[PDB]
């Protein structure tokens, strides 16, 4: 389920992961009021992201910009110019 990924619309994938995680489901004590009885546990609010995760996102924007620089370089006559590096060095 964690490798099933969808972008562009809302989905029940998160709810399914929470339900599978719930301890009672793992025990096998399943009843049809499971969703009403455990409604508070199954639906959970987003937590603040860790600084590490924010670092990864920042790296992703930087690397995507590097790819965009590379695309322009292929079209350009001066392919080996030091300026086309994304070194950000002064």
């Amino acid at each position: 389920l964690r490798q099933y990924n969808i972008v562009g619309l809302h989905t029940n994938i998160d709810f399914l992961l929470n339900l599978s995680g719930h301890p009672e489901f793992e025990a096998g004590n399943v009843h049809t009021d499971f969703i009403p009885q455990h409604h508070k546990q199954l639906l959970l609010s987003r937590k603040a992201a860790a600084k590490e995760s924010l670092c990864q996102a920042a790296l992703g924007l930087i690397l995507k910009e590097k790819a965009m620089t590379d695309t322009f370089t292929l079209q350009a006559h001066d392919q080996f110019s030091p300026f086309s590096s994304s070194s950000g060095r002064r």
Binding site: T69, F80, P82, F83, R90
Partner: protein, 541 residues
């Protein structure tokens, strides 16, 4: 077919040798000294000035450049040390102006930004010279000019060195008009106040951008208006983006803030309809086979010791591949063909005292490069010309002049790097500042003057020893150092790299480990202009 195996330059230095250890230690200290001084210059006017600048909603001058250039692209700053201790009691970090070459919308451009935190952006005499040097670089290489204008006018206490002469403030507008006539785009971004001559910069530009409230343009400031006509008017009403954008028409684009103006500038450059074309053959780039930091141990800081210039070459050229020309003739000079970042280059470097054979060998080499349209790189480490009765009888001056005359007329791009001493006529033969090299850089250990400090001391020690021996009053050895010590101190102080760089004699002091990168960026920029045919004068055979 390019599959031939070839020999490579360079040898592994003896890291354990005491000489290498000492040379590395001395050069490292110079580089560390250079780095920390730049850090201080990076701060401009200071915390109070910077805090005031930001309090008005304006970006800091260096943050403006960071946002203007393409993301992650390198920026080649020029003359970082202009104005360093130039004026007795006034500190002018970087001369009050930041100039350099960066990539905007994929196009190499010259960026000239006033530093409003330094003396409110007033134009000191060095500030004019630094800007004029930047414009000269842009014109010679056909680089579009972007002016981030935030200035406070000329520095009245030193007006005589700013206003009147040909190379004074007036020349700035002359350069703008000439570049515009040549289709070298001139873009001005008014991000602050510009008064008197400053107002001409946006007016003389091909396309112009002004910020909503910060920017102000007026020939006469409010203070002059009140004195002349007794009227009180705010700067915004007299100038301002709205007045020029909507009523005066001086403004071509209207920007909300500094970020918006920089975004607009990138759009303007993208519409220049310019595409770079290369006149030279290109080959894939390769890194040198030896580490660059080994240059610290090899070169050191003692100019009296000598090193093989080939070692320097082996650590900057692609693959450390070098084809030497006339290797065994005039061995004090090294000439050959190589490639830096794929570009072809002809390298001329000193390896001892210049002789008649060396000058002839250089003159022959320069003709070859001009014929094939190959850029030239000069590595100046000079100690003078050969001195002797026989050499003069054989026309050493005639031979030395042959090289001065070939170097001057060469039309291929020329870049000079002073890695050692630069004295007397040897400077001219090796493409000194007077010979219009596209760029000129110096290492932190370099020395430049009319002659070496010792020679001037010894020469005087002959003239006054003679003065009193011939006159007849005896002149003793202690009288000799009351003559020699002041001379040596003067030449040491005035030949220092910082003294040379504080005034704009070179385009910057560079770390030796950065030599390859700086040369690669410089040659890449110089190739924006087509290479012309070289016309020589009469070669005095």
């Amino acid at each position: 077919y390019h599959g031939d195996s070839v020999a490579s330059l360079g040898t592994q230095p003896d890291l354990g040798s005491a000489l290498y250890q000492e040379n590395y230690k001395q050069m490292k200290a110079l580089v560390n000294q250079l780095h920390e001084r730049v850090e201080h210059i990076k701060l401009g006017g200071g915390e109070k000035a910077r805090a005031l600048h930001i309090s008005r909603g304006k970006l800091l001058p260096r943050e403006r450049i960071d946002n203007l250039i393409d993301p992650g692209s390198p920026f080649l700053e020029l003359s970082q040390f202009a104005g360093y201790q130039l004026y007795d009691n006034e500190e002018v970090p970087g001369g009050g102006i930041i100039t350099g070459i960066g990539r905007v919308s994929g196009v190499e451009c010259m960026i000239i930004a006033n530093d409003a935190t330094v003396k409110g952006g007033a134009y000191y005499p060095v500030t004019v010279k630094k800007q004029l040097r930047a414009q000269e670089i842009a014109m010679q290489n056909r680089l579009p000019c972007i002016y981030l204008v935030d200035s406070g006018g000329a520095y009245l206490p030193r007006q005589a060195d700013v206003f009147p002469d040909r190379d004074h403030f007036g020349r700035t507008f002359y350069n703008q008009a000439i570049m515009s006539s040549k289709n070298i785009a001139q873009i001005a971004v008014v991000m602050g106040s510009c008064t008197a001559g400053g107002a001409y910069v946006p007016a003389m530009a091909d396309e112009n951008i002004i910020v909503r409230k910060q920017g102000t343009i007026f020939l006469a400031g409010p203070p002059l208006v009140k004195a002349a006509t007794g009227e009180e008017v705010s700067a915004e009403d007299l100038g301002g983006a709205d007045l020029h954008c909507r009523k005066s028409g001086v403004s071509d684009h209207w920007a909300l803030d500094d970020h918006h103006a920089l975004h607009l500038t990138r759009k303007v450059v993208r519409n220049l309809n310019y595409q770079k074309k290369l006149d030279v053959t290109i080959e894939p780039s390769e890194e040198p086979l030896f580490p660059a930091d080994e240059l610290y141990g090899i070169v050191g800081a003692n100019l009296k010791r000598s090193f093989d210039v080939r070692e320097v070459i082996a650590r900057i050229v692609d693959g450390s591949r070098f084809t030497e020309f006339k290797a065994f003739y005039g061995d004090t000079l090294v000439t050959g063909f190589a490639r830096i970042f794929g570009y072809p280059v002809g390298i001329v470097g000193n390896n001892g005292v210049l002789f008649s054979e060396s000058a002839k060998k250089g003159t022959h080499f320069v003709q070859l490069c001009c014929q094939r349209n190959i850029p030239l790189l000069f590595l100046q480490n000079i100690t003078g010309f050969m001195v002797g009765r026989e050499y003069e009888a054989e026309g050493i001056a005639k031979d030395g002049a042959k090289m001065v005359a070939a170097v001057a007329c060469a039309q291929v791009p020329k870049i000079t790097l002073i890695i050692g001493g630069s004295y007397g006529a040897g400077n001219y033969g090796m493409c000194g500042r007077a010979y219009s090299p596209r760029f000129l850089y110096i290492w932190p250990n370099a020395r430049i003057s009319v002659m070496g400090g010792e020679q001037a001391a010894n020469v005087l020690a002959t003239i006054t020893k003679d003065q009193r021996a011939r006159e007849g009053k005896q002149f003793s050895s202690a009288d000799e150092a009351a003559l020699k010590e002041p001379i040596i101190k003067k030449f040491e102080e005035e030949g220092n790299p910082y003294y040379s760089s504080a005034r704009v004699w070179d385009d910057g002091i560079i770390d030796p480990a950065d030599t390859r990168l700086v040369l690669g960026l410089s040659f890449s920029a110089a190739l924006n202009a087509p290479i012309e045919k070289t016309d020589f004068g009469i070669f005095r055979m």
